[PDB]
Design a protein around this ligand. Structure first.
Ligand code: ANP
Ligand code: ANP
Ligand code: MG
Ligand code: MG
Ligand code: MG
Lengths: 402, 267, 298, 298, 246
């Protein structure tokens, strides 16, 4: 494993700033000195397929314009493309291309690192169990992952116990998990787009974080999966067409029929102004995750809007403003934005179908059509569900479809 | 009096109808079953809107099962031309049939909501009996009036027809129109217009349907959840007090009984 | 006079189903309305019951108005067919009619004996025959000594013993001063009990009066049958000289139709020569006069 | 022989409603079943039709079994009361039966002209009267030259012209060779056309034979009436010496019941002294023989 | 043949039935009005049409033929008709042809105007196969309840209690049998195998009607057609066996 100074860098500026010319290189490389190296676009620093290709151990390193290729695949020895040590504080990794079967950018214990604008094409043949992480973050405070393009890695932007960091504008395509969160308290993520992914957003056991403006286009079986998140904020997310599928490993999640939002043991969080579109399940609310502010969303086009297997009532309207539902057959007499009658998204026969899947054969029966009308006529047999007084009449997310 | 002498027949003829006593015991075993399910879930405003919906399906049904063959069932039976040659008028064999069939509905709902009250005072412990007596006293003297409307509807659709098989077609037509078609026409007028057809006239269209005036009377005090009400959530927009809603229910009797007598006078 | 109907032309809207009938019914006599099935027989009684309006005419029942309830207490009426109330019992429906007419309820049971329904009393009217319902239909009419009966075909579906008992029950009510109007079709037999037949055509009332007056006006042949005569073929001549068609069916049975103006000299021919085995001098029946007048109207 | 019923005893379960009737119907005669309203007249025809099972008896209709369709092609039958299909029209329902019986559809229309229901043809059956349905109910039975009719009260609610026209229609069918069975209750009048009456009690067939046989077997008085006699009160003596009760209703109307075995000498008393204005020597009718035979079995 | 001669009556009597033409008009209006709200608001709308024709085609069949046998016995024409050259089989089978071609025409005005409302408000190669499977199977559902109506008419002795059983068969076979299938699920679990429940759907001809409108399931399609026709063939044989015991 040679070093970056063992190459031939033509210095453009005498402020520890270097420029590697166009031309291939070989083997792993190591940053031990604060060198703000740039690269020409033909600087294909191609490793041979073993080891972390560009290890960084010095603080304040502005890596720019490199093109890394074919590092190792030993995920236990953390064969990254750009490994960043805890002593390598405030590193800038700008506009880089990586293609190799391991970790793209593995950082750990660092502060204020900026991984901006990179394009990380992970793999093509590995079974999404050894592809390695795109942007792995392990207990970092200050990180800034901005406007990247990670493709075909394993579980996307992995984040483990990293406290304060922004995830802004990153495109994540054809990966296992889109953004994975593990105990990342007081986090933030803006405007990310995840496409064709076996889980769009893994939010596991991370509190107090802001999830805003993110998009998930045609992901599989879990649009936004939130496990044990508290005091969070889900504002402006656009979850579209969560089709069924399986993650293939079933490690931390299970296979789903397609849920645009799955709330698992998340106690307090504000879920406002979102857009859950064309999935099989618009929102799955588990029984342990109750009493959180869910108001202003748009549940359009979903085959079943809420799945709530409980008998506790659940009002879904804070400050008198509720959600827009596409199948809300209501009126608005007093010309405000709100509907006039409350909307129960679930019948009792819509929860017998969840308890017993053999009722799908009886789902077209007139007796079921009688039983849907008997609940609307005799409200004593209506189990206390997931209603919202004052639902919205118009679409509130008129800007999120652009 | 002759009005009671022909009431004593129908009081003793309706009680031999096996079809009445089936669906008047069905009204009794459902009003206990709703009130028992209303005791195990404890709310109170859900057990009022379901009982008022239960008597919307059955007190018009018992009224139309009783009295659809009141005039034409006597006309094609031959006993109507005989009865006018007795010292009677046509106004006495209709008002007498109205008293005679009216005491059945006054007893079919005092049996029904009577055992429903004993299925509440003996089930929910600690319930206020004054609020129970007032609410179920309001259920008793207003489900009769709903029954007496459809009783007077049945005399209208019996005097017009000349065949009892066609009277059963109209009685099914009147039961379908007033119970679960006018509630769906008003719903479809409100959903497809999104409440912008008429923001001031549409609450007054509840008064053109006595099943809706019946539901608005019993859901006066216990509004609660508007989604239990459905299109009766227009009922808060009515500026009329509760006492005129009684009077619009009596005017549905008296207009549709004076229409029943004016039709029968040129039979 | 009990029923004084004058000038009535009852119309079914445009069509005048009755035309200018001037009918008078005495206070103890038994009138018989006979005619076609479209002759307006049932509708002619509706004028008497007051439930039909007399168009351009007036009906005087008992000297009073025909729809007054003061006179309907003494006006029994049996219609053509009354399947009364198939769920009620036999005794209770007669108790039901007794309360309406103001008859005492003590009259109800012995009326059922008087018509002969005591074996089938307190049984459902759906379990009754047509003849049993006619017994019940008669039984309500007799409640509380009515001054005026109105029976429209009371003997349909009825055994000829029971019809003969019925006319005895009619004639008993004739002795009590109660006028009866029969509206019948069983015309042989009823002529022994009625006082004045009232045979009417399609629109007009044709002829009223006793059977003597109808036989006096309408000259009809007496139907002498001489069954078992000694000789028949030379007895063909013994009435043709007197002006009678001596039609003979069998070898020795001339059913002659004579003139009934020479009854003694024709029978002295029959009694003098030719032996009388069994003779049927049959007068012109009610059906004979009924045959004459209806074709005389058209 | 057309119908040979022998020893048949039909039971309604336990209750044997008919018992041991041995009825024989010739190939051109016209039988008359008469009795009570529960005497089993309607059920006895069901034995002939084969639809009801002959318990412990055999019925030989036309030399064949009574449930064969090969003989039901020549077996017209009119029931008691048939409100046929009130939404069908009167011409079309007869077209319906003609297709069923194998009758030609060209035979339908002139049957309406023959029965006289041509004016009310092509009108709905609910618009028909009782008598108008009976004309229609006769008309289906006449379809396609039936060898055996079965009429159970064809003359109910029917005009006495039309009933008299009905018996002429029966007598036309007698000449073609078709046996008819009448089950009537209009017993005065029908005796001119039948060949053998068959008065039966509750279970047992009481008496059969012609009216000549019944009056010879059952001793009945001849009902003579001397209306318009000169003197009546000393004419009370003029039959009591001959053994007759000289009952007189009016002043000059003795309705004496004689023996009908000394008819000439009693009438030579009546023609010799006393003047014959109008005389009714009335033979013992079918109704009197009905009255005699029902009580004799009780 | 008199199986057709009595069938021509029931066409002529059924087309003047005021009760049938009111419901058959109401059947055709509700079939366009569901199809209007299934295109403007497809297998998703042919399932909602299957729930409509499970309500009304048993109701149309029971409205035609609840008074077929006992209505003629009360009218007295049944005792007259047995004296005609007619077996008891040919009266029943001919009424089944006559009442059968009425609701074989009432779905051709019912769904014949519904297929017009789809072909002018939208694929038509899929239409004439999904509605050909719909109109045939809706007639065969109606012929079951026609044969059910002949069974209950032959048992009863009065027309008033015939409508009391025709309403009772309609309640039991449409919306009481499937409610006790759900009550055998949600209230019984220790003694109710839910794998057996796809096989208990063959004991209900309203249920077999929906299953041949839900394919476009452990059993194939061809047994399901032969299980719907077996409901005709047993109940007509039951109706012929009951009609011979009057
Ligand atoms: N409501 C009515 N409207 C029109 N015409 C009628 C009505 N009622 C009876 N008719 C006609 O009136 C005529 C005679 O009626 P009706 O008084 O019944 O005579 P009728 O001899 O009593 N019939 P019947 O019962 O056989 O004796 C017939 O042509 C009927 O069609
Ligand atoms: N299905 C039956 N079960 C029991 N008894 C019956 C039944 N049908 C008829 N009967 C009785 O059988 C008896 C004779 O019936 P039926 O043959 O009608 O005598 P009938 O004289 O012809 N009746 P009618 O039409 O008035 O002359 C009557 O007492 C009936 O009540
Ligand atoms: Mg509003
Ligand atoms: Mg008449
Ligand atoms: Mg009889």
């Amino acid at each position: 494993a040679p070093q970056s100074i063992t190459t031939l860098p033509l210095q453009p500026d005498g402020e520890n700033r270097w420029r590697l010319p166009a031309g291939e290189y070989q083997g792993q490389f190591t940053i031990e000195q604060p060198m703000q190296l740039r690269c020409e676009p033909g600087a294909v620093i191609q490793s041979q397929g073993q080891g972390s290709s560009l290890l960084i151990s010095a603080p304040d390193v502005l890596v720019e314009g490199c093109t890394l290729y074919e590092w190792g695949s030993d995920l236990t020895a953390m064969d990254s493309a750009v490994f960043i040590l805890p002593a390598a504080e405030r590193a800038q990794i700008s506009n880089n291309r990586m293609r190799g079967p391991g970790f793209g950018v593995f950082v750990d214990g660092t502060r204020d690192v900026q991984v901006i604008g990179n394009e990380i094409d992970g793999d093509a043949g590995v079974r999404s169990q050894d592809r390695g992480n795109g942007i792995h973050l392990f207990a970092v405070s200050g990180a800034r992952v901005l406007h990247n393009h990670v493709r075909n890695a394993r579980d996307g932007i992995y984040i483990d116990t990293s406290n304060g960091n922004h995830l802004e504008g990153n495109v994540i395509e054809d990966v296992r998990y889109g953004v994975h969160y593990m105990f990342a308290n007081e986090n933030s993520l803006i405007d990310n787009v995840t496409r064709r992914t076996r889980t769009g957003y893994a939010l596991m056991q991370s509190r107090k974080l802001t999830v805003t403006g993110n998009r998930s286009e045609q992901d599989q079986n879990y649009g936004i999966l939130m496990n044990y998140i508290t005091y969070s904020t889900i504002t402006g997310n656009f979850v579209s067409d969560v089709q069924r599928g399986d993650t293939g490993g079933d490690s931390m999640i299970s296979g789903g029929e397609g849920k645009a939002l799955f709330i698992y043991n998340s106690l307090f969080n504000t879920i406002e102004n979102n857009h859950f579109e064309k999935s099989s399940l618009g929102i799955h609310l588990t029984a342990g995750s109750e009493d959180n502010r869910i108001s202003g969303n748009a549940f359009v086009g979903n085959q079943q809007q809420v799945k709530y297997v409980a008998s506790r009532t659940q009002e879904w309207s804070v400050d008198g403003r509720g959600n827009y539902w596409s199948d809300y057959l209501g009126w608005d007499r007093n010309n405000d934005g709100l509907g006039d009658i409350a909307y129960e998204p679930n019948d009792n026969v819509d929860r017998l179908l969840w308890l017993y899947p053999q009722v799908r054969l009886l789902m077209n029966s007139p007796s079921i059509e009688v039983l849907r009308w008997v609940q609307r006529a005799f409200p004593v047999i209506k189990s206390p569900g997931v209603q919202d007084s004052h639902p919205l009449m118009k679409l509130p997310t008129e800007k999120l479809l652009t | 009096n002759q009005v009671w002498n022909i009431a004593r027949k129908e009081l003793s003829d309706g009680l031999r109808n096996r079809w009445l006593l089936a669906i008047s015991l069905l009204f009794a075993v459902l009003a206990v079953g709703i009130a028992w399910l209303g005791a195990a879930a404890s709310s109170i405003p859900a057990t009022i809107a379901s009982l008022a919906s239960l008597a919307t399906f059955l007190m018009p049904l018992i009224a139309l099962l009783l009295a659809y063959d009141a005039i034409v069932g006597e006309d094609e039976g031959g006993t109507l031309m005989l009865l006018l040659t007795y010292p009677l008028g046509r106004g006495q064999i209709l008002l007498g049939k109205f008293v005679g069939h009216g005491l059945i509905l006054a007893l079919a709902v005092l049996i029904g909501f009577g055992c429903a009250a004993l299925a509440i005072a003996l089930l929910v412990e600690g319930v206020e009996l004054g609020m129970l007596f007032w609410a179920f006293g309001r259920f008793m003297i207003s489900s009769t009036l709903l029954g007496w409307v459809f009783l007077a509807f049945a005399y209208v659709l019996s005097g017009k027809v000349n065949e009892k098989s066609s009277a059963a077609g109209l009685a099914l037509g009147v039961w379908f129109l007033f119970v679960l078609v006018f509630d769906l026409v008003l719903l479809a007028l409100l959903v497809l217009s999104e409440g912008k057809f008429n923001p001031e006239l549409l609450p007054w269209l509840l008064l053109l349907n006595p099943t809706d005036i019946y539901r608005l009377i019993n859901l006066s005090g216990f509004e609660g959840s508007g989604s239990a009400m459905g299109v009766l959530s227009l009922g808060a927009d009515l500026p009329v007090p509760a006492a005129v809603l009684w009077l619009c229910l009596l005017a549905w009797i008296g207009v549709s009984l004076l229409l029943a007598y004016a039709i029968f006078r040129r039979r | 006079n009990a029923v004084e109907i004058q000038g009535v032309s009852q119309r079914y809207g445009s069509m005048t189903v009755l035309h200018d009938l001037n009918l008078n019914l005495g206070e103890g006599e038994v009138l018989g309305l006979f005619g076609h099935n479209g002759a307006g027989k049932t509708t002619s009684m509706k004028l008497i019951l007051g439930l039909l309006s007399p168009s351009e005419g007036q009906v005087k029942v008992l000297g009073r108005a025909p729809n007054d309830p003061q006179v309907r207490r003494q006006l029994g009426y049996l219609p053509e067919n009354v399947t009364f109330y198939p769920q009620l019992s036999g005794r209770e429906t007669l108790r039901h009619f007794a309360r309406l007419k103001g008859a005492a309820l003590t009259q109800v049971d012995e009326l059922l004996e008087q018509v002969g329904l005591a074996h089938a009393a307190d049984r459902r009217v759906k379990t009754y025959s047509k003849g049993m319902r006619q017994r019940l239909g008669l039984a309500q009419a007799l409640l509380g000594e009515p001054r005026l009966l109105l029976l429209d075909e009371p003997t349909v579906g009825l055994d000829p013993i029971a019809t003969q008992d019925l006319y005895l029950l009619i004639d008993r009510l004739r002795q009590r001063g109660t006028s009866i109007i029969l509206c019948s079709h069983v015309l042989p037999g009823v002529e022994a009990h009625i006082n004045r037949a009232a045979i009417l055509a399609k629109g007009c009332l044709q002829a009223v009066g006793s059977l003597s007056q109808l036989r006096a006006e309408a000259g009809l042949p007496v139907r002498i049958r001489a069954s078992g005569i000694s000789e028949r073929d030379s007895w063909l001549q013994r009435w043709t000289d007197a002006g009678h068609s001596a039609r003979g069916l069998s070898e020795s049975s001339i059913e002659v139709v004579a003139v009934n103006g020479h009854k003694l000299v024709l029978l002295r021919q029959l009694l003098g020569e030719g032996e009388p085995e069994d003779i049927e001098i049959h007068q012109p029946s009610l059906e004979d006069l009924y045959r004459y007048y209806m074709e005389r109207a058209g």
